[PDB]
Amino acid sequence: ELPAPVKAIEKQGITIIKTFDAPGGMKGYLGKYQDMGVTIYLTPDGKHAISGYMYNEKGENLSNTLIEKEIYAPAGREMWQRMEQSHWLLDGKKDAPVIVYVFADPFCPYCKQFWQQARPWVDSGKVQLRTLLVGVIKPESPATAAAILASKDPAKTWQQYEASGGKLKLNVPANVSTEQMKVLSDNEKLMDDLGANVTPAIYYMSKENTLQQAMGLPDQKTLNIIMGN
Amino acid sequence: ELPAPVKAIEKQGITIIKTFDAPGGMKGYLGKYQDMGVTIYLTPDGKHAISGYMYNEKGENLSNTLIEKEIYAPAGREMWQRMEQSHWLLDGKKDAPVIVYVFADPFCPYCKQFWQQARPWVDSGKVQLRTLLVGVIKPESPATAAAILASKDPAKTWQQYEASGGKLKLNVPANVSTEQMKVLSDNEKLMDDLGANVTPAIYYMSKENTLQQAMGLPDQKTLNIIMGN
């Protein structure tokens, strides 16, 4: 079964996930209390256990690094791959180090404004925006988004669209290709699967490789973090 | 100086108080982050330290026992002794195990009501109420309190006063003895030194010997805890 001192913590409403190797002859237990992951460390004697955070000489919160790397990071990377595999429109260099996904709609003032705030990082080649168009805000939203997706170069047309603030003149299609209705439908299901009920819905990876999100127009702090700044 | 991993925690905004003996070859550091006391444990290797709570086989939160016993318990016992040394009126057996201090005023509905709630525990001989009269609620408050303190048996007169709801008939003194004005003045300074701006202000010791307080009319939970129940 479980060592007495750890069983005592378990009764404090904690559920153990696995055991792991702790430094200094200690045994570690990774667990959770509601949504919060926790680390427990059995002392050498075996009669005591500390519920807390382990730090090394450099000040790294090891407990935090392990929790994120085992409890949080996994699920997020799944949604990141699913986002990567979508038909997103590029903005910036295809090899920009920082990748930012954003669900945008043709009639979303905040989308245009975030597009604007993003200019510096994108022009620098540090950040690339990957836009997943959707049509969920206005009656004409789908017809417009599809008319954007259905052009000679959809990524450029989205740019010119955000830039001009929409005044762009282009041939609406007589038929919205099924391929384009699929992209819109896939993007909208993915947005829903992320519980994103606001556009723009932005997604980025933290320095510790965990999926982060942002809804609406980011304030300066959030903008700086999203931009990897 | 301080071991690297503990110095790392210290920089997280923690101030160390002293070092202590931890089990299993570990060294402990008692500290504080704002008002909260914290325990840090240097692992045997010396390269790591865990900021958290130590539990033994029986489930006792050792970290909590030490913090309260070294950070909280001291100051409270000081105010307890100062309260003990005051001229309080007895209610119940002088040898009742649980001691409860309460600052009361002659015109305080909530004082009368708490007096009422207290009946069961006091009659059982489990709890003794020690009342420190004050005169801070009404113009006639001091004159009344003093008239209570100035009687043949002040403790009984306070009882009969709470019981009868005040209708008690007794000889008001022509002169309020200086001794009685001193008690009222000492009680009022002590009440102030406790930041008690509400009457009744009740004070009791927790099972871990730390000073607890309660202002106004206690709800059922608080009443039960105050009564040691």
Side-chain angles (χ1 to χ4, degrees), chain A residues 158-215:
Chain A
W158 179 242
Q159 285 308 283
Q160 300 183 293
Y161 183 82
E162 295 294 66
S164 69
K167 316 209 167 186
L168 222 198
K169 301 150 283 143
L170 196 59
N171 306 57
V172 186
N175 292 276
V176 162
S177 155
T178 44
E179 162 64 2
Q180 297 132 26
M181 190 60 231
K182 164 165 171 58
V183 172
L184 292 169
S185 287
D186 283 351
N187 293 344
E188 289 152 20
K189 167 64 160 63
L190 175 61
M191 178 175 65
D192 191 345
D193 292 359
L194 287 159
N197 38 53
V198 173
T199 57
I202 311 155
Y203 293 84
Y204 62 102
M205 285 292 242
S206 72
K207 322 287 195 171
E208 260 302 297
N209 295 15
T210 56
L211 188 67
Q212 305 311 319
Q213 81 204 71
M215 309 285 112

Side-chain angles (χ1 to χ4, degrees), chain B residues 80-94:
Chain B
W80 190 245
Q81 297 168 128
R82 186 170 164 200
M83 278 188 281
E84 200 278 337
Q85 289 152 26
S86 303
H87 288 283
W88 40 269
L89 301 179
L90 184 65
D91 189 2
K93 306 197 293 79
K94 64 180 191 172

